Amino acid sequence: DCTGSEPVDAFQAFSEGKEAYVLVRSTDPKARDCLKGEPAGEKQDNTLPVMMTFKQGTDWASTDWTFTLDGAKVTATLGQLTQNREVVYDSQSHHCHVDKVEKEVPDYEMWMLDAGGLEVEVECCRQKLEELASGRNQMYPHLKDC
Numbered sequence: 214d215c216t217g218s219e220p221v222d223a224f225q226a227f228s229e230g231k232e233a234y235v236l237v238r239s240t241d242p243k244a245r246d247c248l249k250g251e252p253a254g255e256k257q258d259n260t261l262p263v264m265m266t267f268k269q270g271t272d273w274a275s276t277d278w279t280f281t282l283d284g285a286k287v288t289a290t291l292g293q294l295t296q297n298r299e300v301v302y303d304s305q306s307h308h309c310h311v312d313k314v315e316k317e318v319p320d321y322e323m324w325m326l327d328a329g330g331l332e333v334e335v336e337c338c339r340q341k342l343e344e345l346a347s348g349r350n351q352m353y354p355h356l357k358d359c
């Protein structure tokens with residue numbers, strides 16, 4: 214069945230902001246190499262401090278974001294930058310989840326704890342992403358010598 218955590222809750226999907234999640238799949242041809250998200254503090258009200266990292270060529274890169282959580286919704290802000298996402302799927306143990314990136318032509322992403330194990334859950338996330346983004350070429354951001 215591949216039934217995951219329901220109802221879907223962004224905070225729960227992020228392991229209550231106690232873990233780092235890496236981007237493993239994306240329909241975005243602009244997806245950044247090694248894009249990783251990690252907690253950078255405790256949960257301020259419905260907001261969560263997050264440090265996003267990635268690699269540009271051989272150089273590591275960094276940015277700080279404020280996540281605003283509302284159920285399954287995630288509003289990420291940095292300066293004048295605002296990114297809206299909706300966690301559409303969340304694995305049983307909150308090991309991996311699938312996001313819809315809100316925009317003119319929406320993109321879909323698969324994030325997961327940076328660890329092995331719970332491979333059936335990983336497969337389920339992959340399956341849910343295929344459903345949401347069927348027919349879309351996928352990129353593998355974490356498979357870039359990260």
Ligand SMILES: CCCCCC[C@@H](O)C/C=C\CCCCCCCC(=O)O
Pocket residue numbers: 227230232233234245248250251252261263265267276278287289296298312324
């Ligand atoms: C809080 C731990 C991180 C969980 C991962 C959240 C995942 O579902 C995606 C949610 C928000 C991602 C924000 C995207 C920010 C872009 C980072 C790269 C860049 O644009 O510079």
